[PDB]
UniProtKB/TrEMBL annotation, chain B:
Organism field: Staphylococcus aureus
Range of the intact protein held here: 138 to 301 of 306
Protein name as it appears in the record: DnaI
GO process annotations (BP): DNA replication
Gene coding for it: dnaI
Domain of life: Bacteria
Chromosomal replication initiator protein DnaA ATPAse domain sequence ranges: 9-90
Length: 163, 164
């Protein structure tokens, strides 16, 4: 499939005002998923449309700066209402029950309830990401992973990138 | 060997200060060629690296001034020495002997001699672009098109973009 034209068309749509689904780019490392996300971002910027790109490892490691006091909700509440959000390299973060049920879950829930374009990039497809989310130190919790992954599916359109 | 990964690698290389070969993106209309060229342009721009994109038909309309007593050489000499040049939709211009032999040809020859990064997009592959340049009102001239297309091929790396 041609991801370039999907990116171009979703840029035109976003700039026109149409409600659209983000892109779920998945594939092995070094296939250009991040570059396509950033290309969408710069393309939108060329038309004055803002967007927010997040590298999930660093972002979660930043939210852990205040997991005790609960001040992480300060930044989460700011990132969750972003007009266009792009979660870069989801599924690579350390899947802990806290990040799954207090960061990722709520984030995607809100961005869905308000229909806000959400782009993704991952080394896993939908089901593989669901398995990644279910497994954790507390064991396999399939219902939470199913809820989250269904949010992802309803927020994005899949595209496979290979070498 | 991915398209997006080739663009990303080329951006990382140019931004690190390494002048490298550009890309020859060819494919039907509506396959994202211009989006990839624009993505390279914007990725370079975000790191303070200027680049130049010309749409060959428009550029030619600006030259045909001009097209007699070398006056056009004023602009052709400036575009040709650009740090990074991207020729959007090469092959869509109406080929005439003077456009081919006095604009396109010399431009690519200069950018090749001086080892200047150059990018391309087209609906034609190498062979189809060469055949496109060979044919004009004066007939088919294959050797010229061979020289030019060989410059293009020395200036780029091909990548095919097919629809869904």
């Amino acid at each position: 499939l041609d991801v370039a034209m999907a990116a171009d068309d979703i840029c035109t749509a976003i700039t026109n005002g149409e409600q659209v689904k983000g892109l779920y780019l998945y594939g092995p490392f070094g296939t250009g998923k991040s570059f396509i996300l950033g290309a969408i971002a710069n393309q939108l910027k060329s038309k004055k449309v803002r967007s927010t790109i997040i590298y999930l490892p660093e972002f979660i490691r930043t939210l852990k700066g205040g997991f005790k006091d609960g001040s992480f909700e300060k930044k989460l509440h700011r990132v969750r209402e972003a007009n266009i959000l792009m979660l870069d390299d989801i599924g690579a973060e350390e899947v802990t029950p806290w990040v799954r049920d207090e960061v990722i879950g709520p984030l995607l829930h809100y961005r869905m309830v308000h229909e806000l374009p959400t782009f993704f990039s991952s080394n896993f497809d939908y089901s593989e990401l669901e398995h990644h989310l279910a497994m954790t130190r507390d064991g396999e919790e399939k219902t939470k992973a199913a809820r989250i992954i269904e949010r992802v599916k309803s927020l994005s359109t899949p595209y496979f990138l290979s070498g």
